[PDB]
């Protein structure tokens, strides 16, 4: 049973939920966590969806080495200056020191792009569109949090190279829309699409697009996925070049994008939908969508037979169902065990209901008990699974809609901010003003994104909240992971 | 096309095949390789088959950290003694030296088994059947060979814990049969199932089962996959203990297996089926089974357009029938470039569409394995191509099988053994099983590289005679044992 309240001590609740659902185990080392099968199945669902979608775009899977040389890692000064502090270095095998230290990848730009330079000889070799599903390492010394912010994590990283800027800019937004679909369609989490400010953009890229989610329980926002236009910054450094088809002998540098999505997804799901009885799984990603549980000697065998009847009908219509007919456990124990793991529907079959040709469906999101005729089993349960998905999104949506507001001045900005909300404010865009906002609001508020579709229209002559410069865009600010 | 020839310079031939088929690219770290999409799709095909199979056995996928602590890594002393010289060690982040160095997994027994010990509190907590698809590092200073022996590689490793020995013993053999299926039914490579000698078994384990494949071109055999029975050696070190009410008060130690398969599969496929024209993909793993190429579109717009339409028609029809078909309709590459390009990549069937054949309602199919061309009635497209593909998969197996059959023979004396081994063959000999004898065989065969034990076959070529002496002459033989030059 769960023993911490989400609205009292959030960290204690998070720990409780992820371990009692059997999603996470703690490793010997700190900041390193084990994805047990209940969590990993959510990641596999995401992968199935996203992998099919990127295949539709022409992207292909590959696998690049986990180690990068010192020379490659250093070639793009801004990138390396941003990542160097947290790069992990291997220096020996056994007692034998290596010829040269080698780095574990924090991101794959510098392991892939010498190869791209090799593969791109002429215009017809482009575009190159590659993806890999792998693990990466960001050995920061700050406090790690399972799923949300870890030292090793699983992700997908895509890397594309194009002959023209237009193709590249188009892919950036196609990928970002896919990420939005993962969050909203699969995990029932609303997200805000936007661009990162100059201070928060990917080091070495030209611009970064992103989706931001809101964790109401802590009043904080978190980046869910990211899609960069790197432009020609990396291709100039790695010499990914092709001869201009029109102008003899002129070399052109490829235009590049990279884009990433991680198991942070599962953490957000958990923070957004979890409750005080445990995890709550959106049906669209649930490993088990329905769990059949008997309640209450010809009658005992008839009851288990009926349970099986329900299992086979639900499987017949492609609903993911488990019948927990274990005799080694109590029915109430089974109830709690599967509520903790977040199974969308509990299907209870007891003797009275069975002789009456009905069963009970219990929704996880609301706890509501429905009695359903045996006749309707497949149809109604399908309906209910869809309602759960919608309900989960709707509630989360309402939270976003009440916790993201507009503020045109610094005083109202501060007041709103420490009520636990995020705030769209008119912003001039300068790094100096962003730093100043951070300290004056101190955790201090960071920039989250410049919304594609902001709440209000910026009006002519609007000044930034610093008063010094004119406003360039409504920008979403808040406390962040 | 290709330059080096397989029978002349095998290492050069192999380098050329894997790069010109765009399977492999060299990394800036010497001895490190990139799996390009054409190679990774074979890995994905193998993963699809085997992942489905082990889910039918109750195995669940998961993911454990890449890093191991000093504490855990030493808790089974023989396992760690076997792996320690090739364990990579992380010693700093950025410029900051770590208080404690941390090791990269060479294999995850020492990452997972502390967790197993936490999760097992009773016999209803068993079995635990977990698998992960990941990468491991074995940083040996011998020189690597792409796919076959690398410092980092992808694999799957499955780890099971059971209350009784009977269940564990059954799983060892079920997984081993699945690996034999991967090799024989997916990659068209015949294998020998067997058990490893005491010298070659998994350090700290009880016994190791294995599948061995023969590479005719080099006369060397190679271990294709392994399925260990770890008994209670690891549960006793990591205290994976449970109590059964059946046995009051006694802490019982789980019975454990671990099993693995890697991208070495692809190298073996390359070494077995490749020829002097390039790679040869078995149809069952082929990313593209059938490539459609229009021929002779040259300097009427209507007839070129109709040629395109007819190619797309073949495309639609072969999709209709679960054939993985791709039409290469690019205008910026000539037809000969495409013929060569897809032959190098090993596409089982080339389907050529010319204007004369289009107007005469036929096409030409070219089988990659034999090169034979076939004019085929257009209506039979869907049905004959299927047939051809099945025949290809069989032919690849048949040829490989007869290779193995003629290169695996029996001998009972060290002189016959040496002659046969210098023939480029592998040998079943009566063997006493002792480690010192295996060391002596390897020294003597080298000059007196050396021959290594490969496996003790489940089904040897001959029944061992009662009272047969090992080829060492000192001790009685325990079993027929396959020996050979090996990777
Ligand atoms: C699990 C996860 C996720 C992410 N990030 C980043 C942005 C991004 C997005 N969007 C990446 C592009 C994909 C994301 O998911 C980042 C991380 N670790 C770290 O920063 C390292 C670390 C370690 C311990 C404490 C604090 C920080 N850990
Ligand atoms: C690609 C691949 C495969 C395998 N091994 C092992 C046995 C096994 C089987 N069966 C694994 C347990 C599953 C296998 O495939 C092993 C390896 N590297 C190494 O030994 C490291 C190395 C590096 C450079 C030179 C020499 C040696 N590299
Ligand atoms: O780390 C990042 O944010 C980018 C996106 C995936 C590849 N690198
Ligand atoms: O390395 C090995 O051979 C065993 C099997 C996979 C996990 N450990
Ligand atoms: Ca940093
Ligand atoms: Ca209850
Ligand atoms: Ca060793
Ligand atoms: Ca034994
Ligand atoms: Ca006791
Ligand atoms: Cl509602
Ligand atoms: Cl200011
Ligand atoms: Cl003696
Ligand atoms: Zn300002
Ligand atoms: Zn002997």
């Amino acid at each position: 049973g769960l023993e911490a309240k989400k609205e009292e001590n959030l960290a204690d609740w998070y720990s409780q939920v992820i371990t009692k659902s059997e999603m996470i185990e703690y490793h010997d080392i700190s900041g390193c966590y084990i994805l047990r099968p209940w969590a990993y199945a959510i990641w596999e669902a995401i992968k199935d969806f996203f992998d099919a979608e990127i295949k539709k775009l022409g992207v292909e899977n590959c696998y690049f080495p986990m180690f990068v040389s010192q020379s490659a890692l250093e070639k793009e000064k801004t990138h390396v200056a941003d990542f160097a502090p947290e790069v992990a270095w291997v220096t020996r095998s056994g007692k034998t020191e290596l010829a040269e230290p080698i780095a574990i990848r924090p991101t794959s730009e510098t392991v892939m792009y010498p190869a791209y330079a090799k593969w791109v000889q002429s215009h017809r070799d482009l575009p190159i569109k590659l993806n890999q599903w792998c693990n990466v390492v960001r050995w920061e010394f700050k406090h790690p949090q399972p799923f949300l912010r870890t030292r090793e994590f699983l992700w997908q990283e895509g890397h594309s190279a194009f002959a023209t800027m237009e193709e590249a800019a188009e892919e950036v937004l196609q990928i970002l829309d896919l990420y939005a679909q993962v969050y909203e369609e699969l995990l029932a989490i609303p997200v805000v699409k936007g661009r990162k400010t100059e201070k928060e953009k990917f080091a070495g890229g030209d611009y970064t697009t992103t989706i931001e989610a809101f964790i109401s329980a802590s009043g904080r926002a978190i980046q869910g996925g990211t899609s960069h236009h790197l432009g020609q910054n990396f291709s100039k450094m790695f010499e990914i070049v092709f001869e201009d088809p029109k102008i003899p002998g002129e070399k052109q540098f490829a235009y590049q994008n990279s884009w990433g999505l991680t198991t942070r997804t599962i953490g957000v799901m958990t923070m957004v939908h979890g409750d005080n009885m445990g995890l709550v799984l959106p049906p669209r990603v649930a490993c088990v969508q329905v769990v059949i549980i008997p309640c209450g000697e010809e009658d005992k065998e008839a009851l288990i037979a009926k349970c099986n009847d329900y299992r086979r009908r639900l499987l017949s219509v492609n609903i993911r169902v488990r019948a927990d007919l274990r005799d080694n456990y109590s029915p109430g124990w089974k109830f709690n065990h599967w509520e903790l793991k977040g199974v969308p529907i509990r299907l209870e079959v007891g003797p009275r209901d069975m002789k009456s040709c009905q069963f009970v469906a219990v929704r996880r999101d609301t706890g509501e008990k429905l009695t359903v005729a045996e006749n309707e089993a497949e149809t109604k349960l399908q309906a209910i699974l869809e309602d759960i998905q919608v309900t989960l999104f709707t509630r989360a949506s309402e939270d976003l809609k009440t916790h993201m507001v507009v503020a045109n001045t610094m005083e109202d900005f501060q007041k709103i901010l420490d009520s636990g909300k995020i705030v769209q404010i008119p912003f001039c865009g300068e790094i100096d003003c962003e730093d100043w906002i951070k300290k004056t609001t101190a955790m201090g508020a960071k920039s989250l994104c410049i919304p594609f579709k902001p709440l209000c229209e910026l009006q002519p002559g609007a000044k930034c909240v610093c008063g010094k410069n004119p406003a360039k865009y409504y920008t979403l600010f808040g406390r962040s992971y």
Side-chain angles (χ1 to χ4, degrees), chain A residues 186-242 244-245 247-296 302-325 330-351 353-354 356-368 370-400 402-410 412-414 416-431:
Chain A
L186 256 57
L187 307 167
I189 290 140
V191 293
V192 185
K193 309 191 193 183
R195 284 173 210 274
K196 292 280 177 181
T197 66
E198 208 203 282
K199 184 197 179 322
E200 290 280 329
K201 79 175 203 188
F202 193 72
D206 275 358
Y207 57 90
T208 293
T209 64
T210 178
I211 50 180
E212 302 299 317
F214 180 60
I215 308 323
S216 148
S218 63
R220 311 242 302 282
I222 190 171
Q223 179 167 31
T226 197
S227 189
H228 316 293
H229 179 60
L230 314 173
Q232 298 172 314
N233 298 313
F234 281 77
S235 54
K236 288 181 176 174
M237 288 314 97
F238 286 97
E239 283 257 85
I240 309 175
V241 317
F242 60 103
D244 185 351
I247 308 301
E250 282 299 314
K251 287 314 187 284
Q252 303 278 294
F253 297 102
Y255 293 85
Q256 292 185 92
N257 309 326
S258 76
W259 26 274
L261 177 93
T262 79
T263 43
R264 179 175 274 180
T265 46
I266 305 164
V268 188
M269 199 208 68
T270 300
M271 286 293 207
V272 165
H273 298 311
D275 64 19
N276 284 325
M277 288 55 87
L279 205 64
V280 172
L281 295 183
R284 178 67 187 70
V285 297
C287 177
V288 177
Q289 295 175 321
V290 180
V291 48
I292 300 169
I293 307 203
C295 326
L303 193 38
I304 291 207
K306 177 61 59 187
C307 275
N308 289 321
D309 292 343
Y310 284 114
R311 202 233 285 261
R312 266 159 20 234
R313 322 174 56 143
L314 294 182
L315 289 163
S316 97
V317 305
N318 298 134
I319 286 170
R320 299 183 295 281
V321 48
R322 196 164 280 171
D324 189 13
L325 320 156
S330 161
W333 183 93
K334 285 175 178 179
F335 283 19
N336 295 298
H337 176 75
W338 293 109
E339 305 184 333
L340 271 161
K341 303 166 75 63
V343 172
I345 296 172
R346 177 175 66 241
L347 200 168
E348 314 169 349
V349 195
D353 291 276
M354 168 186 61
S356 169
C357 291
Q358 62 195 22
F359 65 94
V360 176
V362 190
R363 313 166 45 130
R364 180 64 180 78
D365 58 334
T366 61
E368 278 155 346
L370 289 68
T371 303
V372 185
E374 179 173 11
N375 188 50
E376 273 107 26
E378 312 93 354
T379 324
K380 190 44 185 156
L381 291 191
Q382 181 65 231
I384 299 174
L385 288 173
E386 286 165 16
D387 198 50
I388 292 170
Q389 188 86 18
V390 167
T391 289
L392 289 174
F393 183 77
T394 290
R395 282 151 159 205
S397 279
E398 283 154 359
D399 277 330
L400 186 60
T402 80
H403 289 59
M404 174 175 75
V405 295
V406 193
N408 285 334
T409 88
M410 193 74 192
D412 302 350
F413 176 23
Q414 187 75 54
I416 291 149
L417 177 76
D418 309 304
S419 99
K421 298 183 173 56
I422 54 183
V423 198
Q424 306 193 6
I425 67 175
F427 185 55
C428 75
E430 297 289 325
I431 295 178

Side-chain angles (χ1 to χ4, degrees), chain A residues 138 140 142-144 147-151 153 155 223-226 260 262 264:
Chain A
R138 294 181 190 193
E140 292 202 38
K142 306 201 34 160
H143 182 230
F147 294 128
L148 299 166
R149 206 156 69 124
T150 67
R151 288 194 184 109
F153 52 88
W155 74 350
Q223 179 167 31
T226 197
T262 79
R264 179 175 274 180

Side-chain angles (χ1 to χ4, degrees), chain A residues 428 433 464 466 469:
Chain A
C428 75
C433 190
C464 170
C466 71
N469 304 292

Side-chain angles (χ1 to χ4, degrees), chain A residues 9-23:
Chain A
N9 178 346
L10 187 60
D12 217 292
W13 173 87
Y14 192 59
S15 187
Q16 284 254 279
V17 168
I18 63 186
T19 53
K20 291 173 161 288
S21 60
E22 315 188 306
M23 276 205 307

Side-chain angles (χ1 to χ4, degrees), chain A residues 77-120 122-242 244-245 247-251:
Chain A
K77 294 302 132 52
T78 309
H79 184 63
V80 67
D82 197 295
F83 278 91
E86 67 221 54
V87 162
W89 290 94
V90 171
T91 56
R92 51 189 171 87
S93 157
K95 304 290 181 220
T96 309
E97 320 278 50
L98 298 191
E100 183 153 40
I102 54 178
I104 300 166
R105 52 167 184 237
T107 185
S108 300
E109 281 75 0
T110 63
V111 57
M112 299 172 94
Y113 294 163
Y116 283 39
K118 285 175 191 164
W119 299 335
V120 181
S122 81
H123 173 279
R124 73 189 185 164
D125 298 324
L126 294 158
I128 288 168
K129 296 178 182 185
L130 302 179
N131 175 74
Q132 69 187 18
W133 297 91
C134 67
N135 60 337
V136 278
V137 173
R138 294 181 190 193
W139 200 282
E140 292 202 38
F141 286 86
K142 306 201 34 160
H143 182 230
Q145 212 175 347
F147 294 128
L148 299 166
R149 206 156 69 124
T150 67
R151 288 194 184 109
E152 176 192 9
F153 52 88
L154 285 175
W155 74 350
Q156 61 69 217
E157 55 177 319
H159 296 256
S160 318
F162 304 83
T164 72
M165 170 155 71
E166 175 223 345
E167 307 161 73
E170 176 191 47
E171 178 197 69
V172 170
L173 300 170
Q174 274 159 2
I175 295 300
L176 194 67
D177 193 73
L178 288 180
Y179 288 159
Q181 285 179 45
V182 173
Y183 270 83
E184 304 199 314
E185 228 199 287
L186 256 57
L187 307 167
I189 290 140
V191 293
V192 185
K193 309 191 193 183
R195 284 173 210 274
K196 292 280 177 181
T197 66
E198 208 203 282
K199 184 197 179 322
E200 290 280 329
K201 79 175 203 188
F202 193 72
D206 275 358
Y207 57 90
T208 293
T209 64
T210 178
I211 50 180
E212 302 299 317
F214 180 60
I215 308 323
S216 148
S218 63
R220 311 242 302 282
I222 190 171
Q223 179 167 31
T226 197
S227 189
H228 316 293
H229 179 60
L230 314 173
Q232 298 172 314
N233 298 313
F234 281 77
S235 54
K236 288 181 176 174
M237 288 314 97
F238 286 97
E239 283 257 85
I240 309 175
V241 317
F242 60 103
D244 185 351
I247 308 301
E250 282 299 314
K251 287 314 187 284

